[PDB]
Amino acid sequence: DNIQGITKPAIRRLARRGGVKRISGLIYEETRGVLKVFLENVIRDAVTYTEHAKRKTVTAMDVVYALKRQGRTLYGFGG
Amino acid sequence: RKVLRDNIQGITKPAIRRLARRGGVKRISGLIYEETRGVLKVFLENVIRDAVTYTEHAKRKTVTAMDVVYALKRQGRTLYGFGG
Amino acid sequence: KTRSSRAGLQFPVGRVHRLLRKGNYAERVGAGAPVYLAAVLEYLTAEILELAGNAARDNKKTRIIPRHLQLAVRNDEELNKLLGRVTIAQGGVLPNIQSVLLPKK
Amino acid sequence: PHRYRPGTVALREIRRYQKSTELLIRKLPFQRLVREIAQDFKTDLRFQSSAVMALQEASEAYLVALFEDTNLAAIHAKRVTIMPKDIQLARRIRGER
Amino acid sequence: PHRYRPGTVALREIRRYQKSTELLIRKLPFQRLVREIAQDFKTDLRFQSSAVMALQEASEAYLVALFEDTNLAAIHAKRVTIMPKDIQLARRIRGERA
Amino acid sequence: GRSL
Amino acid sequence: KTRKESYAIYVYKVLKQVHPDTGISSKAMSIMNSFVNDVFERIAGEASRLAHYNKRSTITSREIQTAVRLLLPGELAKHAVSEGTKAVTKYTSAK
DNA sequence: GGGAGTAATCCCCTTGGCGGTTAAAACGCGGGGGACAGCGCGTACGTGCGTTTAAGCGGTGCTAGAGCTGTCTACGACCAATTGAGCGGCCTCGGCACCGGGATTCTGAT
DNA sequence: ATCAGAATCCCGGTGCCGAGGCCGCTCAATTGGTCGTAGACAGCTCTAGCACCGCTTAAACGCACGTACGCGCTGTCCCCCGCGTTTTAACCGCCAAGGGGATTACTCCC
């Protein structure tokens, strides 16, 4: 599964940026699950805007309007 | 035609306990009481400031239930039945 | 001539007025509304760019980059409260280690 | 005669006040607090009776919800007693200032 | 031989990755994940590269923020080590899990 | 203070 | 090519007031353009509701001023209201 | 009376494959120190109840002001003609990115 | 305390490709005008919010008691870190090609 492409050291680096000094070995499967649930919710919205435009290509603006609807505004991608 | 002070102490210790008990709190350290008063006062300050702003914009002198509902809606803490 | 030059603003009063109309925010838009809103957007722009310019100087840079915008926003109390739900691309995070984690010896 | 041990009626109170929907703060003390706060924002305001009740319903709902999050923080510390650091954690993790 | 004590390099990693702004997940693994998830919603969707980059910025910003709350939840339990219960508490108090 |  | 408008030139004009020797990257410029668009939508969207709640058809500068005091915190609102009031004062004083 | 369904066209961009390299990931290993289970105690929380406070009820008075209706006109929407501000594109060069060298400052063992 | 080792930092040299300036053109700001209705505002009225009294007793308070749980310390076990080695595939420069985003016209429906 492609979720396993979110490798352990990558999750550790995110935790290091998050200021985490010591990481239990169970955190990795938790973080994959949380990320997968997060992406599913945002992509569902972005696909909705894409289908409402009857487009086949999901655009960056479809994602920004998803993230803003999710209450999670992102600056820098033209929205 | 009056000025008010220290009314935050009117939020009694057993009243705070009752709210905590409804919140499922089994046991309450006595430092919670002054902490909860501060938290409540901050919450009320934010809501009332907005409700007064809505009241002043409407040029009213009476703060209405609608001004409170809108002030709460601004927080995402929308309160139902009082109107919309 | 143009309303921005009448208002003493850099920001485009006429374009703000156009956007207020076409956004359908109300059935009509009063002539003072775009002048006031342009002045507010100009102020907030100046407020961030002032702080980001200082953050750039602290990094010896001459060009503001998203690092400096994130530093400017998150180090400023009101701007962090205004942008609390905003994520800035390539911004990073503030340097912050919880004191219990430091190697006390 | 009978004499409860500490924390035995706390469960009875937790049941009673969850089942009871009634407002738990005394109405008139809260009303004076609201007016005291409002007096900073505008002198000689008036409040509709329903407006003060709206504020109290929201305030009790807010505090009850925060005490639930506070209780989780205490349980996470493996404590029964809630403490100010538990409120401060709950507020911080909510992102309140 | 020379050897750093446990946690000495973790602190250097914290300092390093809080200085930098680079995206910490590798792009191709994340992109294949995005396509895998998207394929459940509509067959043969296409993505602008800026859309995948936008999803990555949002995902890393979200996870970094969650780890900060997780770190506080661990420290609150007097622990140094973050654990699933710390993530679950953070998620619960955030209201992401009802 | 603040700008402007 | 299709034409896309943005705030880029005005942010740059303001930048050359606050820090004449400083520049801005196109990514940072994209963020600043996003910021202005977002804050515009908040104030206009609030002022719309303030108009609607008063059953009034017009968004005036008074609707903007209350929306600014509702949205912006602390001193940032106070300064913003000061700049907005000065601008409208100067504008209405123009010939 | 103009929104938008839609059909035909361009060519940007997106997917996809491949070959080199080598940065990053996967794995094993040793052991430091962290998690956490026990236990002890003392302080501070809960339950009791006699005393005190003032919240609540009801009643009554009044007048501030919310709300409603009528009239006017200042204001903003629509319009046509005019203009230059703002855009796309082209180009230039120096700020930033990188290498590499030496300085020095942290780390921890002796 | 002192020292050796690793790491990070500061500094100088090279260079490239992104930011700033300039151009020119086109479409959107704006100028001047008419129109007509939003709302300013003035006047009325009668709701309900504020004030006060005063009686009742629900709730708050304070002081005693004791016991339960906060947390301080300690011991042990095993989980994570650091890092040396092997393996993987991320990256990216290139190239292929064709889907469909976007733009046009045509027209008929609401």
Author numbering:
A (entry chain F): 24 to 102
B (entry chain B): 19 to 102
C (entry chain C): 15 to 119
D (entry chain A): 38 to 134
E (entry chain E): 38 to 135
F (entry chain K): 610 to 613
G (entry chain D): 28 to 122
Paper text:
Many proteins interact with a negatively charged “acidic patch” (AP), formed by histones H2A and H2B on both faces of the nucleosome, by inserting an arginine (Arg) side chain into a pocket defined predominantly by H2A E61, E64, D90, and E92.
Our results demonstrate a critical role for the interaction between ALC1RLS and the AP in tethering the remodeler to the nucleosome and in stimulating both remodeling and, to a modest extent, the ATPase activities of ALC1.
